Amino acid sequence: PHSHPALTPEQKKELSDIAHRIVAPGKGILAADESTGSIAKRLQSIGTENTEENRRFYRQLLLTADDRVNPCIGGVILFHETLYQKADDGRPFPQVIKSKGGVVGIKVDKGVVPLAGTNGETTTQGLDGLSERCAQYKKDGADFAKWRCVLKIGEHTPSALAIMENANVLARYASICQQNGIVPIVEPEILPDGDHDLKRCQYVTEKVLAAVYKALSDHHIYLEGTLLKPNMVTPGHACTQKYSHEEIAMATVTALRRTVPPAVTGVTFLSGGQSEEEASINLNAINKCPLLKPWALTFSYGRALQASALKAWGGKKENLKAAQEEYVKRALANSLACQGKYTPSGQAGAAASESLFISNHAY
Amino acid sequence: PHSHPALTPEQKKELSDIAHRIVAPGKGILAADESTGSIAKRLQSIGTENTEENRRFYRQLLLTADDRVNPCIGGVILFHETLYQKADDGRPFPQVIKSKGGVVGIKVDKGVVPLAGTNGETTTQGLDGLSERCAQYKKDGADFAKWRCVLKIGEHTPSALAIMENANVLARYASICQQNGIVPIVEPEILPDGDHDLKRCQYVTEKVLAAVYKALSDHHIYLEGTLLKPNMVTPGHACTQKYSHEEIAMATVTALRRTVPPAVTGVTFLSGGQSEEEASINLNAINKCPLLKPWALTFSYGRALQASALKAWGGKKENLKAAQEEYVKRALANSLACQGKYTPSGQAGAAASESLFISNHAY
Amino acid sequence: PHSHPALTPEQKKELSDIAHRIVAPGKGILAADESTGSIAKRLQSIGTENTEENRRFYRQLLLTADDRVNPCIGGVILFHETLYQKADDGRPFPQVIKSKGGVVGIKVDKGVVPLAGTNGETTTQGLDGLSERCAQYKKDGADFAKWRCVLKIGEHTPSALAIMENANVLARYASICQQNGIVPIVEPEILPDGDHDLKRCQYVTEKVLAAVYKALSDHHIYLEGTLLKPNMVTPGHACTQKYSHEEIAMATVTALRRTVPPAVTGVTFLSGGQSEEEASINLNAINKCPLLKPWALTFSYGRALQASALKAWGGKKENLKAAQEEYVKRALANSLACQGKYTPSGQAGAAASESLFISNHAY
Amino acid sequence: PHSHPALTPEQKKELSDIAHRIVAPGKGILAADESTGSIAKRLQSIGTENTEENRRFYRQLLLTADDRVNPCIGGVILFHETLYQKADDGRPFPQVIKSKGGVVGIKVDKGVVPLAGTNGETTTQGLDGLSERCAQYKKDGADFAKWRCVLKIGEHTPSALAIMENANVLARYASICQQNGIVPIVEPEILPDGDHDLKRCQYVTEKVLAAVYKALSDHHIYLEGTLLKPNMVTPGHACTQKYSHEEIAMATVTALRRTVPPAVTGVTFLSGGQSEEEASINLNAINKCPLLKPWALTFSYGRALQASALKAWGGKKENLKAAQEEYVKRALANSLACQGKYTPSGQAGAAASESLFISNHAY
């Protein structure tokens, strides 16, 4: 019942200013923070040896794409290794990102760990010595951080323990970040894995986010100095029932409207396995949803921004331009999408039913 | 992790439509639901005998005010007794209210009770047989309900128990209401008593509302089909430090933006002891606050709409017209205030802009 | 973090003394508090008309059994109606109970109500005006009370909400009782309905009881001034796998040892549908279980003490003696059982080996 | 509502067996796990350079005390460094401990960290990579671990956040340990700092322990395979009101009885600043307390077992024998104390008739 200010007015202004810059209109985040084990899968996917030089080259390829990406990229998330690597011109990657108008971000979690007594559920580690790490990252150019928690929809999951624990560790992580001038991106990802339908994902997402914000409140988190990186509400990857992009958008916006306080500066959606086009089309539908949305609704895409670029590269240095071109194409597409100005081919166009009305009461 | 829909799409639509009608642009709520004990004090204030006829005459006075109040009153909260009384023309009060465009509300709590082991804290009772009562009230013309919980700011209050328990009982009350087609107004009032400052009230209001919405989530409450009746964020009655209406507005809106999901259809402030003019000026400032406000910000005033009316009447039928004129003036003032168009200059629109020197980072 | 004594040392002593008297060595509780609707189903199983006189007569039959039950009965739970009824000699039933060395108890809950958004789950009502009711019951001879919450084991139950809500309302009920010199018997019954096995029931019981005691702690309940009336840990009524009495006893005592603080004065098991003989044999095995049991482990039987009595009576006055004889038999058996000195007798009738399992009204 | 066994019967047996061995009748724990920063303070108090050699020699001094300590020491907690050091004869310290009949324990927390937004409160870190560390420690001789959380009694402390967070991290630590065959000792220490009285400490201890056990339950902790290391219930260091050892014992035992499930294998009190004699006398009074205690009540002393030994050593190898003698005397004293047979000067008789004139209802 008694307040003991976690932050001063000056610290709040710094965090709010950073958070707003990242999600300024038309801007999104390039998530290029794949850890050693994750990026390995990615290079292996294109028959490329996972060496530090190849990881440096690939990251350089994305970070140095032409200026067309500047107004599309408000922030770039990097993995520790990359934060300390340099481009061919000797410039540290953080300097390269900043020179292009982007805020530098650093992934700080240390992966998921199994929760004993659960059906394969996990929590995330990485709090040990996090304050010192954050202070150093800040000095080295990073202004925001990212931490990923993973929840799964199954017969008995997400369980009460998994929801409670993941929400709690996210709050601890957020608290430590803000004490060091770092904007924490809270990522409580609910995997798309499974044959559950849209309504189920919406229900679980609503319960998970309500838990997340109650935890953030209990831990005295300054919401204006944070961003949310949630899963869009979609049917399971193996769901038999099919849905439209408008339905996905309505379910997503409704879930967020019912759980995310207006104070949260922005929502940066993870692509979670969606193809580059799917992720852009859904983000566009989300921004065109006819409901009031008090926060920026943009992207924090990893795969959905790199899929084609990685393939066009194939590990060959001579495919630099071609690979960068593919990344640019997706950055442009999503910049438009986070503004609801994206058009892939032609959409529905004709064929206007009689009984298919737009009723949000069905969600 | 499994959804068992508490409401059908049709039930949701009905609740949402009701909630929106109550807080439609320019409309607020007349809170005339004073229980037998509370109204006694009011009649006591004007040396009027507390008889059922005087209560009926007084309520009639407010309810039958001229058509000028129609676009100002989206809803009227009544006490059980009044819901079943009739105007002089034989028309049931609910019919009178509806004929003037207002939605009929019924207060359903049964008062506060002490929480053992706390420093004078309470919870509220009234859940027993509540579903049957709601079904009956709905049938008899009521479309929304009200339940008041009371919390106090003191040395060790509000305590964790008080916050948890009051939030839980409000959730139960909201759940039962929605099962019967009744829109529940959630009223977690934090009293202004004490010498605490603005920051303290804002802190407590934020913690209380965070608890309220987590509880509503745990009990599967349909937010779109609810309204919130919170205290404005103000310094304590005995606070030595003085504040401007702009600061009170900023503190209030900030607290709400950090805790109230945008899905909540509307916020109807209680006047909590503020004078009629003070309650109107503050409501106006709240609506002029530059921050983004995703819900209607209006009124649910009792004292702030009746103060002068009650005095002008003094229990004399001869002063009926003068008494109604006082009520109408306040209804008109608050109608403008909930639109940010209140000026003492009669009834204007969009007051004179000034500056943006101060910042909200100090909140 | 600050204490505000809910009770004085004097109040604690009174409650503690009462709780200990009820479960004194060799003593148990006769649960004859069946409400109007439940007792009606009992009189129907014997073709007897459900009238006030028949209920009075049946209750008199049990309460006026010979002195052999005196050492067996530490307390008797009554329903409101019975608390104010008199024996043929004009003595109020409370006086009858006291004269035989028994403590008088009163059921105060008002039945279960559905929890919206759950799969047929419930919570219990009855807190409204409970303080005044307790004050009056105390003056009229009652020293303890009982309140029943009902949980069910299923694919999605008991849900987090059901556990949390039922635990909270039990805590509220317990708090009010202790403020009025009444020892509250907390009854969080987990139904035996279903085909789940022993370990499933043990798991659920452990989770429920942990929730119950955390809530009692949050509400500042004086445990020494309380009693627990839980279900024994048994497999579902439709479970295929069979277990011995020793296994049931082990699962029951282990669950209790892992959740019930030593301060709790006693555990009075509900029979929950078990036959009179089964309930006695299991209680005996429980008391013979090797593990350390820091609390009295006795009975609070309804059906398991009345099965044979109701049948013998058959609604005929001339069968008074015969019916009372059957009750005395079960009281003696269970008195020995709660001491671990019971060894089923030669004849006990097929009525004592008959399953007293009955489903609920809803499902 | 569904169980996914965190442990197999074999795993449970191992943990339970280890826990029971550590607190076997007459046995306690030598806490010699002071981290580098803490042991530094100890050595400087006797003007000794904080070098690894001096630390190794000091720990050797304690671990190689004569066989008289064997029946007194059920377990020895070590700091990482010491677990891998060897005695002068080449034997690894863990081997030294085991040869004397003691179980080897390893402290695994990584110190306290500040909780932002609180009045100087902390949580504890150390979960990162804890599973791998436990697996390594197990392989290297350790069978139990220790983790210290610190709470403080003050104006607004311990806060709801501090209690909840520390309880949760303790549960995570406990879960990880049990997955690796390591018995976790849960240490939620409430500092004695302040002028609060005995009842205040008892209240806070009761609330903290209730929180700890609810968390252990939520995290599926096997209580039989754990030990509790709590502060005894005493007045603050600066409290002007004086209490007898019997009062301290009554408050301590009452607090534990109201919160610690019988399943918990043992309670090993920290000495927390008490002098060697005070700690022994209090532990003795605790074991003589007339109330029923379903768990072993012994010691896990650091300072209370080393004070005189550290001083007698003074960093001089020539004082080896003199120093060891002081430690041996305290080991013998506390072994008698945990049996309730300790009398500071000359023994007389272990006669235990009844207790003094102290009504437990006053607690």
Annotate chain D with three-state secondary structure: CCCCCCCCHHHHHHHHHHHHHHCCCCCEEEEECCCHHHHHHHHHCCCCCCCHHHHHHHHHHHHCCCHHHCCCEEEEEECHHHHCCECCCCCEHHHHHHHCCCEEEEECCCCEEECCCCCCCEEECCCCCHHHHHHHHHHCCCCEEEEEEEECCCCCCCCHHHHHHHHHHHHHHHHHHHHCCCEEEEEEEECCCCCCCHHHHHHHHHHHHHHHHHHHHHCCCCHHHCEECCCCCCCCCCCCCCCCHHHHHHHHHHHHHCCCCCCCCEEEECCCCCCHHHHHHHHHHHHHCCCCCCCEEEEEECHHHHHHHHHHHCCCHHHHHHHHHHHHHHHHHHHHHCCCCCCCCCCCCCCCCCCCCCCHHHC
* Cβ separation C2–B175 shorter than 8 A: no
What does DSSP assign to residue A195? Answer: S
Least CB–CB distance from A259: residue in B254, B261, B293: B261
What does DSSP assign to residue C346? Answer: S
Adjacent-strand bridge partners of B145 = B106, B184
CA pair distance B237, B250, nearest whole angstrom: 18
| Residue stretches of the annotated binding site of C for beta-D-fructose 1,6-bisphosphate | 42, 271-273, 300, 303
Instruction: Calculate how close chain D gets to A274, using CA atoms only, in Å.
Output: 31
Quick one: which of D154, D158, D181, D322 has its CA closest to D238? D154
Nearest-Cα residue of chain B relative to residue A208: B1
What does DSSP assign to residue A355? Answer: S
CA pair distance C113, C110, nearest whole angstrom: 9
CA pair distance D187, D209, nearest whole angstrom: 10
Q: Which of D151, D166, D361, D363 to mutate to test the interface with C (most CBs of C within 10 A)?
A: D361
CA pair distance D209, C261, nearest whole angstrom: 11
Residue with tokens 């294998």: D265
CATH code at A328?
3.20.20.70
Nearest-Cα residue of chain A relative to residue D4: A117
B300 is in an annotated binding site: yes
D199 touches C: beta carbon within 8 Å: yes
Q: In three state form, how does the secondary structure of chain B look?
A: CCCCCCCCHHHHHHHHHHHHHHCCCCCEEEEECCCHHHHHHHHHHCCCCCCHHHHHHHHHHHHCCCHHHCCCEEEEEECHHHHCCECCCCCEHHHHHHHCCCEEEEECCCCEEECCCCCCCEEECCCCCHHHHHHHHHHCCCCEEEEEEEECCCCCCCCHHHHHHHHHHHHHHHHHHHHCCCEEEEEEEECCCCCCCHHHHHHHHHHHHHHHHHHHHHCCCCHHHCEECCCCCCCCCCCCCCCCHHHHHHHHHHHHHCCCCCCCCEEEECCCCCCHHHHHHHHHHHHHCCCCCCCEEEEEECHHHHHHHHHHHCCCHHHHHHHHHHHHHHHHHHHHHCCCCECCCCECCCCCCCCCCCCHHHC
Residues 155-194 of D with CB under 8 A from C: 156-159
Cβ atoms A82, A38 nearer than 8 A: no
* Cβ separation D220–A117 shorter than 8 A: yes
Least CB–CB distance from A16: residue in B10, B259, B361: B361
CA pair distance C287, C246, nearest whole angstrom: 10
Q: What is the identity of the amino acid at A357?
A: F
What does DSSP assign to residue C86? Answer: B
Cβ atoms C46, C311 nearer than 8 A: yes
C111 touches B: beta carbon within 8 Å: no
* Cβ separation B259–A261 shorter than 8 A: yes
Q: What is the identity of the amino acid at C4?
A: H
Range of the domain at D62: 1-363
Q: What Cα–Cα distance (Å) separates residue B33 from each residue in B74, B84, C172? A: 15, 13, 27
CA pair distance D267, D274, nearest whole angstrom: 17
Instruction: Calculate how close chain C gets to B183, using CA atoms only, in Å.
Output: 15
φ/ψ of D87, rounded to 5, equals -75, 175
What does DSSP assign to residue C232? Answer: P
Q: In chain C, what are the helix, strand and coil shares in percent, each to the nearest 5?
A: 45, 15, 40
Quick one: which of C210, C191, C197, C196 has its CA closest to C255? C210
* Cβ separation B1–A156 shorter than 8 A: yes
Q: Which of B128, B149, B222 to mutate to test the interface with C (most CBs of C within 10 A)?
A: B128
Touching subunits of C (3+ CB pairs, under 8 Å) are B, D
Adjacent-strand bridge partners of D122 = D114
Instruction: Calculate how close chain C gets to D204, using CA atoms only, in Å.
Output: 6
Adjacent-strand bridge partners of B271 = none
Instruction: Calculate how close chain A gets to B186, using CA atoms only, in Å.
Output: 16
CA pair distance C321, C329, nearest whole angstrom: 12
Contacting residues of C for D196, CB less than 8 Å apart: none
Elucidation technique: X-ray
Residue with tokens 């640019």: A328
CA pair distance D363, D251, nearest whole angstrom: 6
Least CB–CB distance from D161: residue in A117, A165, A218: A218
A290 touches B: beta carbon within 8 Å: no
Contacting residues of C for D233, CB less than 8 Å apart: none
Say if residue D51 is exposed, middle or buried (CB neighbours under 10 Å; 0-12, 13-18, 19+): exposed
Residues 5-44 of B with CB under 8 A from A: 9-10, 12-13, 16
Query: Number of structural domains, chain D?
Result: 1
CA pair distance C32, B90, nearest whole angstrom: 52
B292 touches A: beta carbon within 8 Å: yes
Q: Which of B110, B218, B221, B222 to mutate to test the interface with C (most CBs of C within 10 A)?
A: B218
Residue D217 tokens, joined: 């339950």
Which residues are within 8 A (CB) of D100 and not within 5 positions of it... i.e. 6 or more apart?
Answer: D63, D67, D69, D70, D73
The CA-to-CA distance between both ends of chain D, in Å, stands at 37
Quick one: which of A241, A230, A244, A255 has its CA closest to A196? A241
φ/ψ of C298, rounded to 5, equals -135, -155
CA pair distance C356, C341, nearest whole angstrom: 24
Cβ atoms B6, B213 nearer than 8 A: no
CA pair distance C180, C134, nearest whole angstrom: 6
Quick one: which of A132, A140, A226 has its CA closest to D113? A132
Residue numbers followed by a gap, chain A, C–N over 2.5 Å: none
Q: In three state form, how does the secondary structure of A66-82 look?
A: CHHHCCCEEEEEECHHH
Contacting residues of C for B128, CB less than 8 Å apart: 110, 125-128
Cβ atoms C124, C116 nearer than 8 A: no
Least CB–CB distance from A126: residue in D7, D128, D175: D128
Residue D77 tokens, joined: 């907690």
CA pair distance A321, A325, nearest whole angstrom: 6
Annotate C94-129 with b (16+ C-beta within 10 A) or e (fewer): bebbbebbbbbbbbbbbebbbbbbbbebbbbbbbbe
- Other CB atoms within 10 Å distance of the CB of residue D132: 11
Least CB–CB distance from B127: residue in C2, C117, C127: C127
Residue with tokens 């924090």: A300
* Cβ separation D117–A168 shorter than 8 A: no
Q: What is the identity of the amino acid at A107?
A: K
The CA-to-CA distance between both ends of chain A, in Å, stands at 36
Q: Which of D4, D123, D176 to mutate to test the interface with A (most CBs of A within 10 A)?
A: D4
* Cβ separation C259–D257 shorter than 8 A: no
Residue B112 CA, chain-centre distance (Å), reads 17
CA pair distance B6, B174, nearest whole angstrom: 12
Which residues are within 8 A (CB) of C304 and not within 5 positions of it... i.e. 6 or more apart?
Answer: C271, C274, C275, C276, C278, C279, C280, C330, C334, C356
* Cβ separation A3–B200 shorter than 8 A: yes
Nearest-Cα residue of chain A relative to residue D109: A128
Residue D252 tokens, joined: 């301590």
A272 is in an annotated binding site: yes
Q: Give the resolution to one decimal, in Å.
A: 1.8
Give the angle subtended at the CA of B353 by the CAs of B348 and B359, to the nearest 5°.
135
CA pair distance B74, B296, nearest whole angstrom: 12
Residue with tokens 């078990």: C274
CA pair distance A95, A92, nearest whole angstrom: 5
CA pair distance A206, A183, nearest whole angstrom: 23
> Mind telling me the catalytic residues of C?
187, 229
Cβ atoms A148, A187 nearer than 8 A: yes
Residue with tokens 């014997």: C46
Contacting residues of D for A128, CB less than 8 Å apart: 110, 125-128
Adjacent-strand bridge partners of D238 = none
Q: What Cα–Cα distance (Å) separates residue D250 from each residue in A115, B66, C222, D287, D338? A: 38, 72, 16, 10, 15
Quick one: which of D300, D293, D216, D298 has its CA closest to D256? D293
Cβ atoms A125, A111 nearer than 8 A: yes
> Mind telling me the catalytic residues of B?
187, 229
What does DSSP assign to residue A350? Answer: S
* Cβ separation A261–B263 shorter than 8 A: no
Q: What is the identity of the amino acid at A243?
A: Y
Residue D73 CA, chain-centre distance (Å), reads 13
